[PDB]
Amino acid sequence: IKERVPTPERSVGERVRDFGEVNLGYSWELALREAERCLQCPVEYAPCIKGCPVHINIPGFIKALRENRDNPSKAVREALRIIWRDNTLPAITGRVCPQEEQCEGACVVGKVGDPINIGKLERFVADYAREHGIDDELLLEEIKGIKRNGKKVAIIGAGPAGLTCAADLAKMGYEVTIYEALHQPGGVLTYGIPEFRLPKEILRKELKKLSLLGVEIKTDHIVGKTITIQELLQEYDAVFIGTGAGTPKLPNIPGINLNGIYSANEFLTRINLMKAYKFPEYDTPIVVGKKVVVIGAGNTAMDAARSALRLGAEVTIAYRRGREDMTARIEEVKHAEEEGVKFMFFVNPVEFIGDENGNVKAVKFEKMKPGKRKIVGTGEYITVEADTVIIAIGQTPNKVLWRATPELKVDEWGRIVVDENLMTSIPGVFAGGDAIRGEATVILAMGDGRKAAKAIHQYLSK
Amino acid sequence: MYKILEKKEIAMRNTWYKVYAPHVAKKVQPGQFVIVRAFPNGERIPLTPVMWDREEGWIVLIVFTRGKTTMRMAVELKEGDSLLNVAGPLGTPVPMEKFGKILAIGAYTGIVEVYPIAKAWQEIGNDVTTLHVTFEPMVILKEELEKAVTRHIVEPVPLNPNQDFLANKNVSQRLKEKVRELLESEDWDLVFMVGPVGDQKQVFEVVKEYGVPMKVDLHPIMVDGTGMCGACRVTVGGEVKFACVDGPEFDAYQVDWDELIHRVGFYAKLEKLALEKYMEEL
Numbered sequence: 001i002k003e004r005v006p007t008p009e010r011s012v013g014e015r016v017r018d019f020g021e022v023n024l025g026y027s028w029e030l031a032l033r034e035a036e037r038c039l040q041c042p043v044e045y046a047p048c049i050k051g052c053p054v055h056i057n058i059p060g061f062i063k064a065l066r067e068n069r070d071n072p073s074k075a076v077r078e079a080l081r082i083i084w085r086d087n088t089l090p091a092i093t094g095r096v097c098p099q100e101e102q103c104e105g106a107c108v109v110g111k112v113g114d115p116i117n118i119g120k121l122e123r124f125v126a127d128y129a130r131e132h133g134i135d136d137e138l139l140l141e142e143i144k145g146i147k148r149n150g151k152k153v154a155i156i157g158a159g160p161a162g163l164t165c166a167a168d169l170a171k172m173g174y175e176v177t178i179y180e181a182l183h184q185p186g187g188v189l190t191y192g193i194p195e196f197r198l199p200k201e202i203l204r205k206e207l208k209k210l211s212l213l214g215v216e217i218k219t220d221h222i223v224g225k226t227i228t229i230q231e232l233l234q235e236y237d238a239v240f241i242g243t244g245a246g247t248p249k250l251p252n253i254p255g256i257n258l259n260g261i262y263s264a265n266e267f268l269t270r271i272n273l274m275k276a277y278k279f280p281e282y283d284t285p286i287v288v289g290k291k292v293v294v295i296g297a298g299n300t301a302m303d304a305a306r307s308a309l310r311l312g313a314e315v316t317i318a319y320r321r322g323r324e325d326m327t328a329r330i331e332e333v334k335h336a337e338e339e340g341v342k343f344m345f346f347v348n349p350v351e352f353i354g355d356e357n358g359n360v361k362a363v364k365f366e367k368m369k370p371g372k373r374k375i376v377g378t379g380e381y382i383t384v385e386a387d388t389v390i391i392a393i394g395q396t397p398n399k400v401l402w403r404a405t406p407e408l409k410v411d412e413w414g415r416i417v418v419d420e421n422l423m424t425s426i427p428g429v430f431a432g433g434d435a436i437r438g439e440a441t442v443i444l445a446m447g448d449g450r451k452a453a454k455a456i457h458q459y460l461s462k
Numbered sequence: 463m464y465k466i467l468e469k470k471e472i473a474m475r476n477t478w479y480k481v482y483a484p485h486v487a488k489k490v491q492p493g494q495f496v497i498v499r500a501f502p503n504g505e506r507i508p509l510t511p512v513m514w515d516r517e518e519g520w521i522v523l524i525v526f527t528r529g530k531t532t533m534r535m536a537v538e539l540k541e542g543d544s545l546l547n548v549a550g551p552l553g554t555p556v557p558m559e560k561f562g563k564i565l566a567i568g569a570y571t572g573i574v575e576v577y578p579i580a581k582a583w584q585e586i587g588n589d590v591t592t593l594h595v596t597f598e599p600m601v602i603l604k605e606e607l608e609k610a611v612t613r614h615i616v617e618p619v620p621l622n623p624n625q626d627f628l629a630n631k632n633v634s635q636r637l638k639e640k641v642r643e644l645l646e647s648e649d650w651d652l653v654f655m656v657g658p659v660g661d662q663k664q665v666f667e668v669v670k671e672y673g674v675p676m677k678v679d680l681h682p683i684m685v686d687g688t689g690m691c692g693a694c695r696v697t698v699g700g701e702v703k704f705a706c707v708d709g710p711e712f713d714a715y716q717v718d719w720d721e722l723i724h725r726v727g728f729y730a731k732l733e734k735l736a737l738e739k740y741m742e743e744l
């Protein structure tokens with residue numbers, strides 16, 4: 001059959017004992033083989049391009065590899081220059097994008113056969129460039145032809161939206177300053193997504209590019225407390241808000257505050273940012289029980305459940321809906337199942353049961369039965385034992401974050417209202433990523449940061 | 463990043479730090495705190511700026527030597543070294559309202575968090591009476607806190623042939639409960655307390671027998687201090703609130719005391735493990 005070339009992966013046995021990257025990705029050899037499967041659909045109506053939220057020339061970078069099978073470094077420099085026109089985080093997006101609902105979901109070969117593995121081919125281009133120093137050559141090539149323009153820009157938040165906005169403005173000659181609330185930049189790339197999905201080398205290399213581009217990162221600076229938007233407006237020609245949507249949704253049901261009940265954000269912050277699993281070499285502690293129940297079935301729940309098993313716990317995922325309703329990446333759902341995570345579907349917590357010492361012991365669920373209609377409960381229940389409960393039923397923007405700047409228009413959910421050029425109700429102030437869309441995707445944050453850098457530039461030209 | 467301009471042992475297990483942090487000093491208000499990381503492999507701990515100079519750009523922190531992070535700061539830090547990360551101001555500033563006759567209590571190093579609050583209440587025209595209950599070698603800020611209506615220092619003995627807590631002097635909580643009947647001898651409009659959760663419950667049970675409104679500086683576990691993790695969550699008025707965002711202060715009649723009490727030493731085992739390993743500095 002003419003199926004898609006597979007990617008190598010470490011065995012369950014080896015990978016469950018550490019936090020190392022599971023999927024080893026394409027080699028130069030396998031990348032060419034997968035590139036030659038693409039039908040080279042015309043650039044103007046190629047469905048894959050349409051499916052990508054930032055519209056990367058997918059056949060363009062694929063054909064670039066195919067024509068330079070002779071020299072890989074030439075082919076990668078060419079494929080990369082094309083990717084970098086629309087996307088500046090290909091190593092993150094190629095690994096974490098939910099392709100099944102985007103580029104690959106749109107791919108014609110998918111209708112009769114397997115769609116082209118666009119994500120792993122984009123990832124290969126980026127990883128090859130990063131390992132062989134191709135991206136370093138191009139970045140230094142950019143820095144030489146960079147001339148200052150006397151103008152300063154402040155950036156609120158150091159996640160993928162803010163990091164992308166800063167890089168593109170620096171390239172334009174602006175004097176960029178990022179204000180970050182935590183002690184390390186990256187946002188979810190530094191506290192949320194783990195090493196087994198995203199090697200920390202990508203983030204470390206991304207901060208090297210910005211330190212080379214001259215951008216300054218002000219850590220331990222909470223905009224709204226340390227400094228206000230008004231104060232920032234008095235010093236900077238423009239501002240860009242990229243504060244995300246990190247407040248955890250916690251159900252106010254009996255037992256929510258028993259010991260052993262964590263939000264996924266806390267549990268992942270302690271592991272990813274604080275390296276608690278390395279306690280006592282690292283000072284941040286973490287308590288993990290013999291039996292863990294994770295509430296939810298998004299990427300956040302997969303990350304939490306998969307992290308818990310690496311700490312020796314037996315893990316169970318409890319979801320409100322069914323197997324097909326899960327929002328997590330189908331590739332990461334597969335990884336959690338092979339690793340041994342048990343799945344419990346159509347269950348909704350109605351209480352977390354505990355002992356007289358205030359520790360969690362069991363979780364009580366209502367059996368549910370199967371878009372803005374939602375579902376309903378059967379009146380039938382089921383109780384499962386648990387020593388640790390991780391809540392992963394979503395995140396939301398800090399609904400009280402904007403109360404230090406009332407002139408900034410914000411909607412019913414805490415999302416910053418923006419115009420077609422991503423400008424807020426305050427001229428000079430722009431905003432992107434989860435601050436405007438609510439909980440979304442890395443590509444959508446990258447893109448908004450890219451778009452706002454063009455609008456800040458245009459708005460600062462007249 | 464943030465220079466330790468001053469460092470001195472002001473009492474038993476109490477260190478004064480005068481940290482250069484112009485970002486926090488220019489904006490901090492009574493009731494607001496900071497998140498500090500002193501070491502590359504270290505944790506983030508909440509501490510309170512006791513005093514500040516907005517012009518000169520410094521904050522004063524008084525840390526009680528409690529375990530690994532607070533002990534490693536006391537032993538390995540020197541006047542001229544820098545704190546890695548100082549994030550703030552954090553939390554909601556304490557309301558600066560005309561309450562009247564206020565009793566502001568501080569158990570142990572809790573008086574350090576009473577000081578910025580009590581001082582501002584007095585300046586705005588409130589008749590503040592501060593109270594400090596602790597061990598006799600742990601008496602701190604007597605002269606300073608002596609700039610109000612009137613101060614009392616009730617100091618139990620740290621008895622050497624006695625262990626750490628029960629049946630009887632971490633049960634210095636017995637005298638704090640006894641002296642709390644400052645009620646029955648005087649009229650109060652507000653009771654405020656910084657102290658261990660169990661001590662806040664015992665005192666509130668006494669104040670409750672009278673109809674005096676009460677505020678409490680709640681100390682749940684904190685990681686980020688910016689509202690993005692919910693470790694600091696408390697059930698206030700039946701609602702799930704985050705103490706790093708909505709607090710640290712909350713109405714003592716709206717708090718679920720039994721819940722916060724069980725959440726006191728969840729990390730105890732790992733905490734004694736972390737100290738034990740560091741103590742092996744021979």
Ligand SMILES: Cc1cc2nc3c(=O)[nH]c(=O)nc-3n(C[C@H](O)[C@H](O)[C@H](O)COP(=O)(O)OP(=O)(O)OC[C@H]3O[C@@H](n4cnc5c(N)ncnc54)[C@H](O)[C@@H]3O)c2cc1C
Nearest residue numbers: 157158159160181187188192223244299300433434441442
């Ligand atoms: C567990 C998890 C798994 C995920 N998995 C995927 C996936 O598989 N695929 C995918 O496409 N996307 C995924 N995402 C989403 C992605 O990681 C991004 O977080 C999201 O797409 C957009 O985030 P952002 O960069 O816009 O904001 P964030 O990434 O939240 O950036 C916010 C940053 O700004 C700082 N900040 C916030 N508020 C303030 C303030 N008031 N003042 C100063 N600084 C502030 C914070 O330090 C924070 O780090 C995941 C997210 C999480 C949490």
Ligand SMILES: Cc1cc2nc3c(=O)[nH]c(=O)nc-3n(C[C@H](O)[C@H](O)[C@H](O)COP(=O)(O)OP(=O)(O)OC[C@H]3O[C@@H](n4cnc5c(N)ncnc54)[C@H](O)[C@@H]3O)c2cc1C
Nearest residue numbers: 507508509510524525526528529530531532681683684733
């Ligand atoms: C809002 C707030 C303000 C504070 N202000 C001051 C102050 O001005 N001066 C002062 O000396 N201390 C203060 N503390 C207490 C201080 O944060 C902790 O004692 C310290 O972080 C413990 O560090 P450790 O590793 O030395 O002790 P650990 O061995 O970690 O634990 C000692 C005790 O402190 C508590 N604790 C541990 N970690 C934390 C944490 N991250 N946050 C809160 N409590 C914790 C635990 O319940 C434990 O019983 C404050 C705490 C809070 C929540």
Ligand code: SF4
Nearest residue numbers: 038039041048107116
């Ligand atoms: S759609 Fe499938 S085939 Fe047509 S270009 Fe995009 S990838 Fe190649």
Ligand code: SF4
Nearest residue numbers: 052093097102103119
């Ligand atoms: S970015 Fe996400 S969507 Fe656009 S191509 Fe790379 S993977 Fe497919």
Ligand code: FES
Nearest residue numbers: 687689691692706
């Ligand atoms: S400290 Fe984690 S949200 Fe308050």
Ligand SMILES: [Mg+2]
Nearest residue numbers: 529530531733
């Ligand atoms: Mg500690």
